[PDB]
């Protein structure tokens, strides 16, 4: 069975020019831990499959923090990738974040010609890319942003909708108080399909270490903050 994931770096938006070299920035989302690779470094560089013309990244060659072989993608784990290119005039280009799981092994990412909302700046777009045969379950990484936006795409498989909302409160609620109001959080759950009480319970579980002492994690909203934001009653 195939451990490579493929990238079509030939049929691209006009702005990408003509591809010279291809890179794959792959990271863990849930159920696994991967070390950070270097943007467009040795570890990320893909080779062209002469048979098909597709570039590929072999997940079996991933290494863990200790430098040992990771053993590939895990069952019950979520990942994400950015494919980037350097074109023949040395300009960098990159896809949006695309979700990735074991069922994608052997499949191909292509540019759709569409865009998705950039999670850092809602006035900007990323180039949309998705899977040829797995787009129903993996694709552009849906995200909840620092401003409380819910961007288009696929959600992680092994992370619940309530847990994703709680993660967003954890990351953003204290630092962006004015975007994380009870009514925006309310709309976040509705668009993401998370029941507020489920979010509250998920929050309490996923951030028990962090809620323990505030001085260690000022940016982690205490449960009293979370209940009110969710309109819930821990009672």
Place of tokens 């990771």: 70
Q: What is the spatial distance between Cα 166 and Cα 229, in angstroms, rounded to a whole number?
A: 11
Q: How many domains does the chain have?
A: 2
In a domain, 77, yes or no: yes
Query: CB neighbours of 67 closer than 8 A, spacing ≥ 6?
Result: none
SS3 177: coil
Handedness of CA 188, 189, 190, 196 (dihedral sign): negative
Rama region for 170: left / alpha / beta (φ>0; ψ in -120 to 50; rest): alpha
Rama region for 31: left / alpha / beta (φ>0; ψ in -120 to 50; rest): left
In a domain, 139, yes or no: no
In a domain, 42, yes or no: yes
In a domain, 171, yes or no: yes
In a domain, 144, yes or no: no
Handedness of CA 81, 85, 91, 95 (dihedral sign): negative
In a domain, 149, yes or no: no
Structural domain harbouring 44: 4-131
In a domain, 26, yes or no: yes
In a domain, 153, yes or no: no
Place of tokens 């953003």: 172
- Domain end, chosen from 114, 131, 148, is at 131
Residues 107 and 30 grouped into a single domain: yes
Q: What is the spatial distance between Cα 62 and Cα 87, in angstroms, rounded to a whole number?
A: 25
Q: How far is CA 39 from CA 3, 18, 82, 114, in A?
A: 22, 20, 10, 24
Residues 16 and 59 grouped into a single domain: yes
Q: How far is CA 67 from CA 41, 91, 196, in A?
A: 16, 31, 41
- Domain end, chosen from 131, 147, 170, is at 131
Query: CB neighbours of 32 closer than 8 A, spacing ≥ 6?
Result: 73, 74, 77, 78, 79
Q: What is the spatial distance between Cα 213 and Cα 50, in angstroms, rounded to a whole number?
A: 56
Data resolution in angstroms: 2.1
Q: Exposure of 169 by Cβ count < 10 A (0-12 exposed, 13-18 middle, 19+ buried)?
A: buried
Give kind and range of the element (H or E) at residue 209: helix 208-211
Q: What is the spatial distance between Cα 201 and Cα 190, in angstroms, rounded to a whole number?
A: 17
Residues 70 and 121 grouped into a single domain: yes
SS3 193: coil
Q: How far is CA 20 from CA 28, 38, 46, 98, 159, in A?
A: 27, 19, 11, 22, 36
Q: What is the spatial distance between Cα 26 and Cα 37, in angstroms, rounded to a whole number?
A: 8
**Can you read off the two tokens belonging to residue 69?**
């072989």
Place of tokens 């990271």: 27
């Amino acid at each position: 069975t195939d451990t490579k994931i493929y990238f079509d770096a030939s049929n691209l938006p006009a702005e990408w020019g003509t591809t010279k070299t291809v890179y794959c920035h792959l990271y863990a989302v849930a159920g696994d831990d991967l070390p950070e690779t270097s943007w467009q470094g040795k570890a990320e560089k893909c080779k062209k499959d002469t048979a098909t013309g597709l570039y590929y990244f072999d997940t079996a060659k991933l290494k863990s923090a200790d430098g040992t072989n990771h053993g590939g993608l895990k069952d019950n784990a979520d990942y994400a990738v950015i494919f980037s290119t350097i074109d023949t005039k040395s300009q960098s280009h990159q896809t949006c974040n695309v979700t990735l799981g074991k069922p994608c092994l052997g499949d191909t990412i292509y540019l759709t010609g569409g865009t998705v909302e950039n999670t850092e700046d809602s006035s900007k777009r990323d180039f949309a890319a998705t899977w040829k045969n797995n787009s129903d379950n993996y694709g552009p990484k849906a995200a909840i942003t620092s401003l409380g936006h819910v961007t288009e795409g696929r959600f992680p498989i092994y992370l619940s909708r309530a847990e994703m909302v709680a993660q967003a409160i954890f990351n953003w609620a204290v630092k962006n108080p004015k975007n994380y109001t009870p009514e925006t959080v309310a709309d976040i759950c509705a668009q993401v399909e998370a029941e507020p009480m489920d979010v509250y319970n998920a929050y309490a579980e996923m951030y028990a270490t962090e809620l323990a002492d505030p001085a260690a994690y000022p940016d982690c909203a205490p449960l009293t903050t979370v209940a009110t934001l969710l309109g819930v009653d821990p009672s």
